[PDB]
Structures are given as C-alpha cells and as structure tokens.
C-alpha cells in the first residue's frame, strides 16, 4: 500500500501535466480549425458575390 501510494502520487503529477499538454494541443488545433472555417466561409461569400 505504501509503495502504491508513492507511485499513485507520482502518476497523478504526471497525468495532470499530460492533461495540461493535451488540453493545450486540442485547444490550439480547434482554434486553427475555427480560423480555417472562417476564411473558407469568407471566400465562398466572395465567390458567390
């Protein structure tokens, strides 16, 4: 139990850091996707006009 306590604390630290990283990556890629869609819609409007 003591050994698993230490290892679980270490894994908690690791998973929290890794979750910060994954949140950042997902948010960044979502933002880029958003911008791509925005530009696409603007371009399609331009083409229609």
């Amino acid at each position: 139990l003591e050994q698993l306590e230490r290892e679980f604390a270490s894994s908690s630290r690791l998973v929290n850091q890794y979750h910060s990283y994954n949140q950042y990556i997902l948010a960044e890629r979502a933002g880029k996707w958003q911008d791509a869609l925005k530009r696409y819609t603007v371009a399609e409007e331009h083409v229609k006009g």
Binding site: Q23, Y24, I25, R29, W33, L37, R39, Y40, V47
Partner: protein, 147 residues
C-alpha cells in the same frame, strides 16, 4: 439625333463593361481558388481534431470548433506551446525516478502531409502550410503495464 447619341454612348460603354467583366472574371477565378484551398485546409484541421479527440484524453462537449475553443480557451492564454513542452519534459524526467517498473517511454507522432499541398496554390498560401507543418507533430507518452 437621339439615335446617333445613343449609338455613340453605347460604343463608349460596351468596351468599358467588357473590361469590367474581364477583371471580374479574373478576380472570380482567384476567389474560387481561395475558397477551394480553405475548404481543403478546414477539412484537414477537422480531421486533425477528430483524430485527437478519438484518443479520448479530453472530453468534448459539443463537436464545434467555436464551442471546442470556448470549452478550453482559458488554457490558451494560460500556457504557450514551447513553455508547456519544456515543463512537460521537466515533469516527465522527474517522475521517471518513481515509475521505473512501468518503464515510461515517449515517442512522437506525425500526420501524413496532405498530397494536395502539391497543387500549385501559389506563394500566397505557402505560409499556412508551414503553420500546419510546424503544428502537426505531437508528443505521446506510453507506459507498459500488466502486459
């Protein structure tokens, strides 16, 4: 007099509108290329996001890029890519002391550089493909556990 005036006026105007049509069609072709390019780029980024969500490391409330950003935008001002990478590595090395049994290893992953970048989009678009090239790579951490 009215007929001669009209024919002179039309002789003046018709070439003008033909030139306007020439310029308009050129601009229309340019805009169509722009729209096609951004279609392909937006779909590529959507595929990126779907692939990353499929990993399941983060739960997604509504599959909409504006909503997804709204779900996490606070973090984007919280961290910066390079700083986050450095601190992730710093945590990863220290915790390697404890979890030797699991034998942590980290390897990178890369998406297939879309072939349609080969098409002659022109210099204007090249920076965005460079942005994609830089941002596409990602890091994954894996541990060996119970086989």
């Amino acid at each position: 007099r009215e007929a001669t005036e009209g024919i002179n006026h039309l002789l003046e105007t018709i070439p003008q509108k033909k030139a306007k049509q020439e310029t308009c069609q050129n601009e229309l072709a340019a805009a169509k290329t722009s729209a096609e390019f951004w279609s392909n780029m937006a779909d590529e980024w959507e595929q990126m996001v779907r692939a990353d969500i499929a990993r399941g490391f983060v739960e997604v409330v509504e599959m909409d890029p504006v909503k997804i950003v709204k779900q996490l935008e606070s973090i984007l001002g919280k961290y910066d890519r390079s700083k986050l990478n450095e601190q992730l590595t710093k945590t990863f090395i220290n915790e390697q002391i404890f979890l030797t049994e699991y034998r942590m290893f980290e390897y990178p992953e890369e998406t297939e550089r879309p072939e349609w970048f080969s098409k002659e989009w022109g210099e204007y678009y090249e920076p965005f493909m460079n942005e994609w090239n830089q941002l596409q790579s990602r890091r994954l951490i894996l541990m060996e556990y119970k086989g």
